[PDB]
Homo-oligomer: A and B are copies of this chain.
């Protein structure tokens, strides 16, 4: 009848070279999202098509001097193609020269951080089953029950409870140990037994909350939005050195993306990578201190690669669309536009996206280990620090003995 020269670009999962492409020939050399999409457009619009990768290898832009269009846009304007079933972003400068359909895929700028791991434990990590409000109120109560036991014994007599001895009865009461002497007045018996019931609940609450932490691994991200990235300075963030994503933050005006751009423009060292593969490798080799601002479709795809190291957080920052382009004044413009809206409402576009991102995507969708010395290392430090601060006070003691 006539052959239709379609044009796409080499980009996963849209068009990939199949494993046996040196022995296959025709439209069977290539596989991917746009290969399956071109098959669906052809069966609805009724044409025979020839898959053809763009020679220039770009998407399409107009030179500011020669006014000549590069990429897949250039093959439609000048005549080398009949349709571009490809991830072309529907933009203002391209709609003036070629005709887009409705967006078969909606996307935007997203955040790629490294997938969060357990943590490194600090020194006072052993205190974390109880909040700092609790630990300070225990110290306040330990001074509290010792001052009262001093006033219970010295005033209203029955002795052997000084300000140093009342701290020493209540201390072994806390860690459930044995003391030298017991109170013998009923006022002192209340100070004993009620503080005994206090530390019984606190030790049990410490052990039970630590058992919940060691059983259920509940990892969180520091970043859940670009509002979170703007407020912080610990995690660095950047875009690619040339493209629509860096140009988005350059001319943005809202509240946050201006704040994010003044960060990225100023920051030393350079947050701007030069390749997408450089920005993904910089996320993995930064131990969770670099976030790469890129498109949501690549962000969901790289998250389904190996290793399982990157993560998409938050929502999109803008709203773009990928359209199927035809030359202006073409006989394919209207039926392909009606074909995209038919495939969208039937679930075909959702089905092909679940296939090439999740079904054909690796890393789809324990056995508690021993506690390392890192988790309880601060308890050794207070212990030896307690042994060091006891040899000093004994040396302070024989300065006046």
Q: A211 with B208: in contact, given A103-B103, A255-B255, A397-B156 (CB under 8 Å)? A: yes
Taking CB atoms, residues of chain B closer than 8 Å to A28 are none
Of A2-10, A61-69, A279-287, A315-323, the one with at least 4 CB within 8 A of chain B: A315-323
A351 CA / B254 CA spacing, docked (Å): 7
Taking CB atoms, residues of chain B closer than 8 Å to A278 are none
Interface string of A186-216 (1 = CB under 8 A from B): 1111111111111111111111111111111
Q: A319 with B344: in contact, given A187-B393, A214-B209 (CB under 8 Å)? A: yes
**Copies per complex of this chain:** 4
Q: Which residue of B lies closest to A168 (CB)?
A: B189
Of A12-20, A72-80, A141-149, A269-277, the one with at least 4 CB within 8 A of chain B: A141-149
Min CB distance A155 to B, Å, is 7
A338 CA / B219 CA spacing, docked (Å): 46
Min CB distance A213 to B, Å, is 5
Q: Are B105 and A102 in contact (CB under 8 A)?
A: no
Q: Are B198 and A204 in contact (CB under 8 A)?
A: no
Taking CB atoms, residues of chain B closer than 8 Å to A368 are 131, 209, 212-213, 215-216
A319 CA / B174 CA spacing, docked (Å): 60
Min CB distance A389 to B, Å, is 6
Taking CB atoms, residues of chain B closer than 8 Å to A184 are 180
Q: Which of A214-235 contact B (CB under 8 A)?
A: 214-219, 233
Q: Which residue of B lies closest to A187 (CB)?
A: B394
A133 CA / B337 CA spacing, docked (Å): 59
Taking CB atoms, residues of chain B closer than 8 Å to A131 are 368, 370-373
Min CB distance A321 to B, Å, is 7
Cβ of A382 within 8 Å of any chain B Cβ, yes or no, is yes
Of A33-41, A49-57, A87-95, the one with at least 4 CB within 8 A of chain B: A87-95
Min CB distance A93 to B, Å, is 9
Cβ of A329 within 8 Å of any chain B Cβ, yes or no, is no
Report the count of interface residues on A (CB-CB < 8 A): 139
Q: Are A386 and B96 in contact (CB under 8 A)?
A: no
Q: Are A338 and B96 in contact (CB under 8 A)?
A: yes
A214 CA / B190 CA spacing, docked (Å): 31
Q: Are A175 and B202 in contact (CB under 8 A)?
A: no
A344 CA / B5 CA spacing, docked (Å): 31
Contact of A262 among B173, B193, B359, B390 (CB under 8 A): B359
A365 CA / B92 CA spacing, docked (Å): 32
Q: Are A379 and B178 in contact (CB under 8 A)?
A: no
A-B contact pairs, 16 of them (CB 8 A): A103-B106, A128-B369, A130-B371, A155-B394, A178-B180, A197-B382, A198-B380, A208-B211, A208-B214, A209-B368, A212-B217, A213-B368, A233-B364, A254-B350, A254-B351, A266-B359
Q: Which residues of A contact B (CB under 8 A)?
A: 90-92, 95-96, 100, 102-103, 105-106, 126, 128-131, 133-134, 137, 141, 144-145, 148, 151-152, 155-158, 164, 167-168, 171-182, 184-219, 233, 251-255, 258-259, 262, 266, 268, 315, 318-321, 337-338, 341-342, 344-347, 349-351, 354, 359-360, 362, 364-373, 375-376, 379-380, 382-387, 389-391, 393-395, 397-398, 401
